[PDB]
Amino acid sequence: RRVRRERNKLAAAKCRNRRRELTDRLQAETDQLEEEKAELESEIAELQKEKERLEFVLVA
């Protein structure tokens, strides 16, 4: 009786901890992806500007 309860408690703690670990890692990679989003946006804007200027120079 007691041993069954104990074993089950340890199984629950195992899955719980593995789940918290995956949660944390997923938060980390999600943050990194957000950073990549911002950076990509900035770079796109900057290259589009540089292209505009480049074309003003090519036209004139």
- Binding region for a copy of itself (CB under 8 A): 8, 11-12, 15-16, 18-19, 22-23, 25-26, 28-30, 32-37, 39-41, 43-44, 46-48, 50-51, 53-55, 57-58, 60
Q: Distance (Å, rounded) from C-alpha 29 to C-alpha 52?
A: 35
Provide the minimum distance between the beta carbon of 27 and a copy of itself in the complex, in angstroms, as a whole number.
Answer: 10
Q: Distance (Å, rounded) from C-alpha 49 to C-alpha 60?
A: 17
Provide the minimum distance between the beta carbon of 38 and a copy of itself in the complex, in angstroms, as a whole number.
Answer: 10
1 DSSP 8-state letter? -
